Short mmCIF file of N, CA and C in Angstrom, two decimals:
data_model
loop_
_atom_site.label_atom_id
_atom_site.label_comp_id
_atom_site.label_asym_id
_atom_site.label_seq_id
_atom_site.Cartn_x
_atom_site.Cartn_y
_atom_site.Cartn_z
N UNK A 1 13.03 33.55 -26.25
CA UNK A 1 12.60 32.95 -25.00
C UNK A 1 12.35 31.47 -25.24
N UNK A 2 12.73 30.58 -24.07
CA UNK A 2 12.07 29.17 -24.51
C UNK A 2 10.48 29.36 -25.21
N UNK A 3 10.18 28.50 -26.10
CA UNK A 3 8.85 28.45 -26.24
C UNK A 3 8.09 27.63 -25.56
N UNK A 4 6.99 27.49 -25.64
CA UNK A 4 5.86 26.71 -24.90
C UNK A 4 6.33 25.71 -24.40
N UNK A 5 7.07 24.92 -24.88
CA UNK A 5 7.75 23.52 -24.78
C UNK A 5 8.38 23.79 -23.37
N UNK A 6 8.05 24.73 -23.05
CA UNK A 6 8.69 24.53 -21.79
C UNK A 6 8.17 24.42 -20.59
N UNK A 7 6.74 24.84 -21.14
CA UNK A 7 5.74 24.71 -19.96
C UNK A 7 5.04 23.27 -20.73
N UNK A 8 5.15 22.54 -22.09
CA UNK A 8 4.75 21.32 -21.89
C UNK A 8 5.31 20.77 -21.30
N UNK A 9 6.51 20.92 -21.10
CA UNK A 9 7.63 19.74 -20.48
C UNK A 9 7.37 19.53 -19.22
N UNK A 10 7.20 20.61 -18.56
CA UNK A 10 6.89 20.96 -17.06
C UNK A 10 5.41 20.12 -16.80
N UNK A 11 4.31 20.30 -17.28
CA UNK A 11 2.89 20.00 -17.33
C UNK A 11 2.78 19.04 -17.79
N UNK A 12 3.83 18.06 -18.76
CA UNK A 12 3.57 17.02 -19.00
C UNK A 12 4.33 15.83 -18.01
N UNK A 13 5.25 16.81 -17.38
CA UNK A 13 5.92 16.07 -15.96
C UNK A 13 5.03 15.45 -15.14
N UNK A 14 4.07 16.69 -14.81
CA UNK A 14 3.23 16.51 -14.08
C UNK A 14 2.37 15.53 -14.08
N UNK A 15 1.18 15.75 -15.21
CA UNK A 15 0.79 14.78 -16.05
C UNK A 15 0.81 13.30 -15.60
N UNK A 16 2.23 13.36 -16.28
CA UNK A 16 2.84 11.94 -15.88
C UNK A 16 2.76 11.26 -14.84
N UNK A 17 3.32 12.30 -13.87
CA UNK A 17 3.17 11.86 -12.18
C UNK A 17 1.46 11.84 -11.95
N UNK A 18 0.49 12.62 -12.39
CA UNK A 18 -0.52 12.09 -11.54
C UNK A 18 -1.04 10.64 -12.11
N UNK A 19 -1.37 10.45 -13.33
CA UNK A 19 -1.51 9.30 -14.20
C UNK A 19 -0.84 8.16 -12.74
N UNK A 20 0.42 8.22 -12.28
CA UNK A 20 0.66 7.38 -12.04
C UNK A 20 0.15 6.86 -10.42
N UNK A 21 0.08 8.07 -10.20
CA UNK A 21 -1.17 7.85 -8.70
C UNK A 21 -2.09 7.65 -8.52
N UNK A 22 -2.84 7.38 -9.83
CA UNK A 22 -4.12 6.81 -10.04
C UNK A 22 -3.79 5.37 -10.06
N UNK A 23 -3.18 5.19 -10.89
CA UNK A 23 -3.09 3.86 -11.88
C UNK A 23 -2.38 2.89 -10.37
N UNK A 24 -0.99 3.42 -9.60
CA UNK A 24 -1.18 2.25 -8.16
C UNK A 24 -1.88 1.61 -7.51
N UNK A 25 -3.27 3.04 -7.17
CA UNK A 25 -4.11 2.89 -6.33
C UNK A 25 -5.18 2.47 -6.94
N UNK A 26 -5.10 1.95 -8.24
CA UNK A 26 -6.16 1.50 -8.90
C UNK A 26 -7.97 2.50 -8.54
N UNK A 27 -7.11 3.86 -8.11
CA UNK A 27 -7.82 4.82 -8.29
C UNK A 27 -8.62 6.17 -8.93
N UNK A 28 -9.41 6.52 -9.96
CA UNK A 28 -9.87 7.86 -10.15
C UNK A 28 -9.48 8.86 -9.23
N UNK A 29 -9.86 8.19 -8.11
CA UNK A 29 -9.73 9.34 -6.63
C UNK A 29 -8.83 8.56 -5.57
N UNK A 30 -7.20 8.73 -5.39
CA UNK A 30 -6.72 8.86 -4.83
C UNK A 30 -6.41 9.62 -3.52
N UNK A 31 -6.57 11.24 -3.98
CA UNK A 31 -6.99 12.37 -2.93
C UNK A 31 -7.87 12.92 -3.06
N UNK A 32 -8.22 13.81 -2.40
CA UNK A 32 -9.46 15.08 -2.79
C UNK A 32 -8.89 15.56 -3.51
N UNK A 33 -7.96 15.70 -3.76
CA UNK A 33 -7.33 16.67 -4.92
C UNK A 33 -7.96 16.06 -6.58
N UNK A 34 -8.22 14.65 -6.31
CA UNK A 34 -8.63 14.11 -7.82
C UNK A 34 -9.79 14.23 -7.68
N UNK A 35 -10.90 14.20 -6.90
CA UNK A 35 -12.41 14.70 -6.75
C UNK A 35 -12.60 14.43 -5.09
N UNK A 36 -12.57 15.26 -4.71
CA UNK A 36 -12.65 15.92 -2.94
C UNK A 36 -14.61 15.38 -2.68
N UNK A 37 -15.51 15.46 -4.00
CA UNK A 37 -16.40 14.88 -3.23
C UNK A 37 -16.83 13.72 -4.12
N UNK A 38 -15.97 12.72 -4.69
CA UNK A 38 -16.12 11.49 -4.79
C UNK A 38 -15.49 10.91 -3.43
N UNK A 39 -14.45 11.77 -2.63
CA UNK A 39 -13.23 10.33 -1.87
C UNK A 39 -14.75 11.14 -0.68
N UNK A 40 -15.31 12.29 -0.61
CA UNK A 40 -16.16 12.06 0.84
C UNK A 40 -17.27 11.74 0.59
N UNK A 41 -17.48 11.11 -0.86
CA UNK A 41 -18.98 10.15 -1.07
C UNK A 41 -18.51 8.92 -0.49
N UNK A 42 -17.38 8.20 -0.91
CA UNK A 42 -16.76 6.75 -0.87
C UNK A 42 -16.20 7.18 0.68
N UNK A 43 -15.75 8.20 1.38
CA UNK A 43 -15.59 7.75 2.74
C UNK A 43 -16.78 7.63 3.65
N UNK A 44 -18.08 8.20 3.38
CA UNK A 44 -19.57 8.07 4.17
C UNK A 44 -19.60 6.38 3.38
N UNK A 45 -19.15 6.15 1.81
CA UNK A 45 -19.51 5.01 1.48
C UNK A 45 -18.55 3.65 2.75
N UNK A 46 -17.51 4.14 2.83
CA UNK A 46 -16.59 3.35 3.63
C UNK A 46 -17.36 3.04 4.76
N UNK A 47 -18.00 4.21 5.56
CA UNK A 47 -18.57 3.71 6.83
C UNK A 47 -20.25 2.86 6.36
N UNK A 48 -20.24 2.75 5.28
CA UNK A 48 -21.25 1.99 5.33
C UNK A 48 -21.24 0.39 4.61
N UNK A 49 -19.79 0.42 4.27
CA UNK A 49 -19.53 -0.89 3.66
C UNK A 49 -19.31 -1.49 4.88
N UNK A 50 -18.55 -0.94 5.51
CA UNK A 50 -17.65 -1.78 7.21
C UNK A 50 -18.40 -1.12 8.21
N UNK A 51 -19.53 -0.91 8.35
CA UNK A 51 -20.76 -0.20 9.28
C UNK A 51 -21.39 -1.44 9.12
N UNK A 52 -21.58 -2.06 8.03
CA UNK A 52 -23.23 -2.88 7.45
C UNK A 52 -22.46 -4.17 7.61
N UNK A 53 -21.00 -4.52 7.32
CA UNK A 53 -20.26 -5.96 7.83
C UNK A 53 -20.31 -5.97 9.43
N UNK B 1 -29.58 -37.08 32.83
CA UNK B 1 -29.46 -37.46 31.32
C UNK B 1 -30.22 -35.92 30.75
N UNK B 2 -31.59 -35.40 31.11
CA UNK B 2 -32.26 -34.47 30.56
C UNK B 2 -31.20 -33.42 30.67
N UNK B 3 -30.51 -33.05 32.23
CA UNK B 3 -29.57 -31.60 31.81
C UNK B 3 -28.55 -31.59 30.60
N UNK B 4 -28.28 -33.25 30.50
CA UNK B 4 -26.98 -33.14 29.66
C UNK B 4 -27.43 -32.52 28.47
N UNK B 5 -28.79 -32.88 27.93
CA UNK B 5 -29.41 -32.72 26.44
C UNK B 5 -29.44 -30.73 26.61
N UNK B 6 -29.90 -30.63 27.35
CA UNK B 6 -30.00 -29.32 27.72
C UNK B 6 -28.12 -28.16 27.82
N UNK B 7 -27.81 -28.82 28.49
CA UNK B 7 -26.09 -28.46 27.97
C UNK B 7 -25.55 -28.43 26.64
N UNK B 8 -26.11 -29.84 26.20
CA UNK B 8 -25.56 -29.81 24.60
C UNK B 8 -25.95 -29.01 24.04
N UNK B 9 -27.45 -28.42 24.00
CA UNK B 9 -28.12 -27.24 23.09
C UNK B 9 -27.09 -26.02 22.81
N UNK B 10 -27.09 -26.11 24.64
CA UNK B 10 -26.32 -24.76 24.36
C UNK B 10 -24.73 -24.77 24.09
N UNK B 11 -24.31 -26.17 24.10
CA UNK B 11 -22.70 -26.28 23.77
C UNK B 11 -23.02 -26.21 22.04
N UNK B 12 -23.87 -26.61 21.47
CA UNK B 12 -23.72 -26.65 19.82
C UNK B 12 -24.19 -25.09 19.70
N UNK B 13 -24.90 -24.41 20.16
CA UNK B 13 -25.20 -22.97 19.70
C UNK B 13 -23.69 -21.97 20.89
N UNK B 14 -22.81 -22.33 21.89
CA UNK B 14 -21.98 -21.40 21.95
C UNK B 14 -20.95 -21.67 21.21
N UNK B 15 -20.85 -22.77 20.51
CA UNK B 15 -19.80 -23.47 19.50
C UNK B 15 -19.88 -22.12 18.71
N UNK B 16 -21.55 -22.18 17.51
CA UNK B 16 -22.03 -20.99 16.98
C UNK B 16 -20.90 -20.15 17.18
N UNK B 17 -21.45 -19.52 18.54
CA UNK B 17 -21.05 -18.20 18.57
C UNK B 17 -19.26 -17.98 18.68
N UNK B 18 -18.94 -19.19 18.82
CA UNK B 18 -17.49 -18.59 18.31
C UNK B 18 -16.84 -18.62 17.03
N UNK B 19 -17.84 -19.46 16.01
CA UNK B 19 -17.44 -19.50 15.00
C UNK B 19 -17.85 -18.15 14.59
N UNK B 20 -19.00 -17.62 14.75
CA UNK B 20 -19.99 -16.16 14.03
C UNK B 20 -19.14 -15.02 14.79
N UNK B 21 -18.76 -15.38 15.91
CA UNK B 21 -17.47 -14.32 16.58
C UNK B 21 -16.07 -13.88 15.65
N UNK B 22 -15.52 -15.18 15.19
CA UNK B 22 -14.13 -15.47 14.96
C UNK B 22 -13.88 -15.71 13.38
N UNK B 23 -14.64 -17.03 13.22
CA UNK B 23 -14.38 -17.36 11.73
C UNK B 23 -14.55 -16.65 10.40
N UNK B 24 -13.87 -16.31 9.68
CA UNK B 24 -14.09 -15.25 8.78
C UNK B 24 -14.72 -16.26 7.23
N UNK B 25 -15.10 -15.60 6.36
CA UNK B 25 -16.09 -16.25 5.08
C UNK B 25 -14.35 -16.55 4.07
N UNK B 26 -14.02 -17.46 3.87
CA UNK B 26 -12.41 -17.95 3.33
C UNK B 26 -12.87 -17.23 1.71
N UNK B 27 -14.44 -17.43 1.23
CA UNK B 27 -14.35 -17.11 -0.01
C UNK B 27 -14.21 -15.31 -0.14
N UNK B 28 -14.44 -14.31 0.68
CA UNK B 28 -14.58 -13.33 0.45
C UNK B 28 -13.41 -12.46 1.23
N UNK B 29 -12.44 -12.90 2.06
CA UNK B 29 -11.62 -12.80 2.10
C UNK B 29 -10.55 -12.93 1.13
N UNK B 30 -10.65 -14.05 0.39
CA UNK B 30 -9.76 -14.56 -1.03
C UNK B 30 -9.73 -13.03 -1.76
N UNK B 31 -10.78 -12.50 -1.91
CA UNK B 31 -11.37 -12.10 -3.03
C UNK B 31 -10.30 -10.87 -2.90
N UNK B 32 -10.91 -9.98 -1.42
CA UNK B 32 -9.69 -9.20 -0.89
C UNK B 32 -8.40 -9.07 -1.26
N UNK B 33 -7.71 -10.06 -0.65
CA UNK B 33 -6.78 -10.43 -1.31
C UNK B 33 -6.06 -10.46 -2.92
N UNK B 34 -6.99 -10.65 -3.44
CA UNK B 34 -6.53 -10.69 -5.07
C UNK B 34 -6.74 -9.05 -5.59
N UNK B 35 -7.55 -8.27 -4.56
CA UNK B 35 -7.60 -7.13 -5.09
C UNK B 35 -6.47 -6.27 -4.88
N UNK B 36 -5.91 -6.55 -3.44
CA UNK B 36 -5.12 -6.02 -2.34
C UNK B 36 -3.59 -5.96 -3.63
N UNK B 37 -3.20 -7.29 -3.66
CA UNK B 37 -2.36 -7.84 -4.54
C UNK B 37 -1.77 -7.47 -6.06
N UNK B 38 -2.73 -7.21 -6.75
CA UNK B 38 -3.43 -6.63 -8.49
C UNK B 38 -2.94 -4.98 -7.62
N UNK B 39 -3.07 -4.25 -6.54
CA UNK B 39 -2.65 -2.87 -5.69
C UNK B 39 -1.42 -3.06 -5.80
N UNK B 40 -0.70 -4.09 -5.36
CA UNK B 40 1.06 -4.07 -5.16
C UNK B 40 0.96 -3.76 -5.75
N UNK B 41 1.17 -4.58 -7.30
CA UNK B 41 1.97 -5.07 -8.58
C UNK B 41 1.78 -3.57 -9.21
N UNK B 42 0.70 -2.98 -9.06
CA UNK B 42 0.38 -1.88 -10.02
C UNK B 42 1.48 -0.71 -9.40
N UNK B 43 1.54 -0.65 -7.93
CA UNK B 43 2.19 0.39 -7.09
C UNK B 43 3.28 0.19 -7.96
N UNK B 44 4.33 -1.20 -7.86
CA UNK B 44 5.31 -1.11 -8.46
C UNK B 44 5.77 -0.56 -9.43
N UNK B 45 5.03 -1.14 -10.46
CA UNK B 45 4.81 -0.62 -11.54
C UNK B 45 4.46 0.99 -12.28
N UNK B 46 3.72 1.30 -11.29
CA UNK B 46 3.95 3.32 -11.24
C UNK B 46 5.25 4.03 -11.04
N UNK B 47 5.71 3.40 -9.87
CA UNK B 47 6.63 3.96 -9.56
C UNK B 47 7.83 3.82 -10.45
N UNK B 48 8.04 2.43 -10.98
CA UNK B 48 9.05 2.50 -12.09
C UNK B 48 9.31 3.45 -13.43
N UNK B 49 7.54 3.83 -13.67
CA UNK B 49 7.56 4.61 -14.19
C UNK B 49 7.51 6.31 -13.61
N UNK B 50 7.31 6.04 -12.72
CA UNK B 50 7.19 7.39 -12.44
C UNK B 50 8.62 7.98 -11.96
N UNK B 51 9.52 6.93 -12.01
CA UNK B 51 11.05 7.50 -12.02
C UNK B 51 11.29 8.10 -13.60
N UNK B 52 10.72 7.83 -14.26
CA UNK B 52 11.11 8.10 -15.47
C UNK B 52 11.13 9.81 -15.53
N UNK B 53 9.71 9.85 -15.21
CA UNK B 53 9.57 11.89 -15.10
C UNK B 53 11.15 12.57 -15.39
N UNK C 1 4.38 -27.75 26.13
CA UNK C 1 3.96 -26.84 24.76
C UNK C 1 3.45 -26.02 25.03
N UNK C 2 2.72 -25.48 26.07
CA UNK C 2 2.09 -24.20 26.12
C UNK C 2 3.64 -23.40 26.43
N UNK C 3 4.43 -23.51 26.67
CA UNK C 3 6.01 -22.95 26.77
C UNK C 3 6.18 -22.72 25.45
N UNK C 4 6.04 -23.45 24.62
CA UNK C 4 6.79 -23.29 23.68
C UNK C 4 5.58 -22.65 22.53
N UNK C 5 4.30 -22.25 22.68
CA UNK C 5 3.66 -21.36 22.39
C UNK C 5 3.94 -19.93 22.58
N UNK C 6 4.40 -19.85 23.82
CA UNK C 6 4.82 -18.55 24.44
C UNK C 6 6.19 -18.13 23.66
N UNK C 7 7.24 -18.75 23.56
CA UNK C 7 8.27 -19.06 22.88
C UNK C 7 8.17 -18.59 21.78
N UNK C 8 7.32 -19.06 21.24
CA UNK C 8 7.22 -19.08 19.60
C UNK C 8 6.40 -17.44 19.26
N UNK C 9 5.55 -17.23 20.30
CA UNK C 9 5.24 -15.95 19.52
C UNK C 9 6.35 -14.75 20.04
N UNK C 10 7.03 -14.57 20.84
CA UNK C 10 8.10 -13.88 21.16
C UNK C 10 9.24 -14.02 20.09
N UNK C 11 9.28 -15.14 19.62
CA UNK C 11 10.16 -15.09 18.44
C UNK C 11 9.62 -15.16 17.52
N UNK C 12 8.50 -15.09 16.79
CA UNK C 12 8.16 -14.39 15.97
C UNK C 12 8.33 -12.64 15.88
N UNK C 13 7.86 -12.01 17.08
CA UNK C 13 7.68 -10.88 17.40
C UNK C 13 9.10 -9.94 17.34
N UNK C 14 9.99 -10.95 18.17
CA UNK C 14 11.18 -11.04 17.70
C UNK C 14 12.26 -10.53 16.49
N UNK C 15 11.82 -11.35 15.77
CA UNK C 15 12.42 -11.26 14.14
C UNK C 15 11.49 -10.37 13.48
N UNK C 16 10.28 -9.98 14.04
CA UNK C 16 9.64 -8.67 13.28
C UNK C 16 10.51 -7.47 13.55
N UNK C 17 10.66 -7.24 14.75
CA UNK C 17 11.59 -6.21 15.42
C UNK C 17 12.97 -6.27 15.27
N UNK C 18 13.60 -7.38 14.56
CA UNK C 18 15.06 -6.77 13.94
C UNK C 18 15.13 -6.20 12.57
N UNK C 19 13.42 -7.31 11.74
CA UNK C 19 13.40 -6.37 10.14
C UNK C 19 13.22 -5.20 10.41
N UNK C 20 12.05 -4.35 11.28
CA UNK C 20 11.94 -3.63 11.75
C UNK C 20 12.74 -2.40 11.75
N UNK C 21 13.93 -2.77 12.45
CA UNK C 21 15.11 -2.42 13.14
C UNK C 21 16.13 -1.76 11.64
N UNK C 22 16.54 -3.18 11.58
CA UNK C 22 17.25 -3.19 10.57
C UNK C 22 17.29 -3.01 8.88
N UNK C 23 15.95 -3.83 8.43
CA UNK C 23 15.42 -4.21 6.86
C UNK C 23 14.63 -2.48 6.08
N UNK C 24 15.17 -2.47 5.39
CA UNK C 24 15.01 -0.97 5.08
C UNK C 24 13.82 -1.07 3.33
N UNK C 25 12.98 -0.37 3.11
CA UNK C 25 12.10 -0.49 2.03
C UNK C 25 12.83 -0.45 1.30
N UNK C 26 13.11 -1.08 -0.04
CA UNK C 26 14.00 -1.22 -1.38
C UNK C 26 13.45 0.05 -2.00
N UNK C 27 12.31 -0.02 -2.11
CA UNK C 27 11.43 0.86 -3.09
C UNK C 27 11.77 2.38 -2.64
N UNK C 28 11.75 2.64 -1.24
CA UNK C 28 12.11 3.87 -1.47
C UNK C 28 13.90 4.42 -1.38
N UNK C 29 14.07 3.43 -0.90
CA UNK C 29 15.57 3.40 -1.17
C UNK C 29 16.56 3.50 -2.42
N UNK C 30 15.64 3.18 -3.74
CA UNK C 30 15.67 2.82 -4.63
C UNK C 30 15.64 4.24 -5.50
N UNK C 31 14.47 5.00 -5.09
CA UNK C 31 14.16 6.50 -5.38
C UNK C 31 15.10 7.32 -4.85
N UNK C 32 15.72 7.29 -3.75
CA UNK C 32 16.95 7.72 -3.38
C UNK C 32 18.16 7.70 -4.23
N UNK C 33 18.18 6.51 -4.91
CA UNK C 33 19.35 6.19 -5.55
C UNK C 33 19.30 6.88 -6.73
N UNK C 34 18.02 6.45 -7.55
CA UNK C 34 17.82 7.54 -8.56
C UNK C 34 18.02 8.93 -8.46
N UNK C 35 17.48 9.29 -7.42
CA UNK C 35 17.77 10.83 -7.42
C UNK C 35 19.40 11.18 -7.40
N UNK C 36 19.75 9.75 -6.28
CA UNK C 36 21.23 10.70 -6.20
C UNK C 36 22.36 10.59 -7.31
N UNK C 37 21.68 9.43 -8.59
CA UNK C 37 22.15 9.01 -9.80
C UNK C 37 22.55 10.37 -10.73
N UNK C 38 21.19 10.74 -10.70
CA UNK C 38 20.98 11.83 -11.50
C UNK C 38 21.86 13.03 -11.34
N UNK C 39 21.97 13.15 -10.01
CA UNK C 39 22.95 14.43 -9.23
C UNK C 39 24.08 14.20 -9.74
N UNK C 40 24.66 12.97 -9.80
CA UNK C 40 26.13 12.64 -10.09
C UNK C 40 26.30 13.17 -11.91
N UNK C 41 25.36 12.32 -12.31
CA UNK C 41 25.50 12.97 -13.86
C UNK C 41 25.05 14.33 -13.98
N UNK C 42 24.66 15.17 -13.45
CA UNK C 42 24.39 16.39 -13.34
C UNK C 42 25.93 17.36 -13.14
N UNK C 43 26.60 17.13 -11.79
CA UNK C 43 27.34 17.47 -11.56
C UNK C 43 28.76 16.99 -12.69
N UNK C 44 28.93 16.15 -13.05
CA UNK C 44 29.88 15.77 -14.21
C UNK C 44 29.63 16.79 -15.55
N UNK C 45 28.43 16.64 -15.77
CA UNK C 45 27.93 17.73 -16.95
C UNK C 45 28.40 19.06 -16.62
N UNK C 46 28.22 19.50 -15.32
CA UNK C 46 28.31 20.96 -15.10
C UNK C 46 29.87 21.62 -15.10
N UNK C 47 30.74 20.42 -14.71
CA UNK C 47 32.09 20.65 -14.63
C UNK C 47 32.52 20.81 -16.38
N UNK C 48 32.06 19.79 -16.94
CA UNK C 48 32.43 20.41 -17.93
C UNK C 48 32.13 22.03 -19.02
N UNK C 49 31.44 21.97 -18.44
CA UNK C 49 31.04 23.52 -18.90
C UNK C 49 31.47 24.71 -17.86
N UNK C 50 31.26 24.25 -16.96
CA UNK C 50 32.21 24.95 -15.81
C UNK C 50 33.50 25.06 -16.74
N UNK C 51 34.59 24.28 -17.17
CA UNK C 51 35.98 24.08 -17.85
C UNK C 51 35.78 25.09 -19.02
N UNK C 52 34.15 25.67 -19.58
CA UNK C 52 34.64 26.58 -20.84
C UNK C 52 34.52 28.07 -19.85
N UNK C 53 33.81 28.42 -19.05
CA UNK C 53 33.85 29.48 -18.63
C UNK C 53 35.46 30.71 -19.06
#
């Protein structure tokens, strides 16, 4: 059977791709998917950065 | 002569209010900007790699 | 000149709406190409092994 290497390859695909959706958005948290309650700390934070301007 | 002084008050304070309406702070806007910017370059830059996957 | 204020933002507005129209994102256009790069060398590979069947 393939060995493991085949699910690194796959998982390190991945990997790869999220690394890089951070690193555009010069984000940790891009989606909720990267921490669901950091982006709805920083979106109550949003309404209070541009609430308080 | 007294209304005119009395006009001016309020022509130098509705001046004010269109600047405190309209005019934006040039230094903190800049700042924006350089962050906004440092966002392209990086987007680009993901994605070049993230063709790689 | 107030004509040619009027003027001028219509043609600005203008030439937004033919990039618009016409001017297409490189970047993702670009990912397109890659993908359909890949297909081509994909399909070349397969013919040849297709030929040992």
């Amino acid at each position: 059977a393939a060995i493991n290497s085949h699910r690194v390859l796959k998982f390190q695909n991945e990997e790869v791709s999220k690394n890089m959706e951070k690193l555009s958005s010069g984000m940790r948290i891009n989606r909720a998917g990267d921490d669901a309650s950091g982006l709805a700390v920083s979106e109550k934070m949003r309404t209070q950065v541009n609430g308080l301007r | 002569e007294h209304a005119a002084k009395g006009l001016m008050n309020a022509y130098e304070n509705t001046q004010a209010s269109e600047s405190r309406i309209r005019d934006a702070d040039m230094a903190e806007e800049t700042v924006a900007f350089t962050k906004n910017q440092i966002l392209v370059q990086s987007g680009t830059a993901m994605l070049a790699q993230a063709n790689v996957r």
